[PDB]
Structure 1
């Protein structure tokens, strides 16, 4: 579970800072939620939770559902915010986020 990996108060603050439409910034979010403090192993555990269908990749729909991974009542990312995050992460043209790419997203936050 996400709450075993990260502070509920950190998740609350991080989610709260991006309620406004089109405001999402993955680097600031991942920093605020405390993901930079996690071991490589825990970063991976986070990826697998966000990988809702366990395909081994975060596809677009799971990417838009990312905040719900951290707190279930959070908003979806808009189509545009998702395009932005996919562009930020998908550096190998696969059309989806591999584990390596999520690790990179977090380490570069």
Structure 2
């Protein structure tokens, strides 16, 4: 759904930089693809897609396929890479990244 809403080549540079098995962080990746360039509104729409279980929330499982909107199966978290996104974006440390938390980590990425 966000594959046509992106630049295409921007997703090939971020994923090509993290493809390693633990080379993903979340800042250099999103900063590359260009998700922060989107507008807070078009960001709430990017998150609505991150929301895998349609629960207006980004749970740890979402993090596993966080880059799914860009690729049904693009970057497959290594597990440790998923433990970074969760402890790098979850500021309140609640276990769920709502929008403001997500759009805040997508723009500061």
Taking structure 2 as the reference length, what is the TM-score of the superposition? Answer: 0.91
Whole-angstrom CA distance in 1 between matches of 2:78 and 2:55: 22
Deviation at 1:107, TM superposition (A): 2.1
Aligned residues, how many?
109
Question: What do you get for the CA RMSD once the two structures are aligned?
Answer: 1.3
- Name which of structure 1's ranges 33-42 and 65-74 shifts more when overlaid on structure 2: 65-74
Whole-angstrom CA distance in 1 between matches of 2:71 and 2:20: 16
CA-to-aligned-CA distance 1:14-48 (integer Å, 9 cap, x gap): 21111111000211111111112111111111101
* Structure 2: stretches of 5+ with no match in the other structure: none
**Contact 2:87 2:93 (C-alpha < 8 Å) held by counterparts:** no
**Contact 1:15 1:67 (C-alpha < 8 Å) held by counterparts:** no
* Structure 1: stretches of 5+ with no match in the other structure: none
CA-to-aligned-CA distance 1:34-66 (integer Å, 9 cap, x gap): 112111111111101111111111111111111
Taking structure 1 as the reference length, what is the TM-score of the superposition? Answer: 0.91
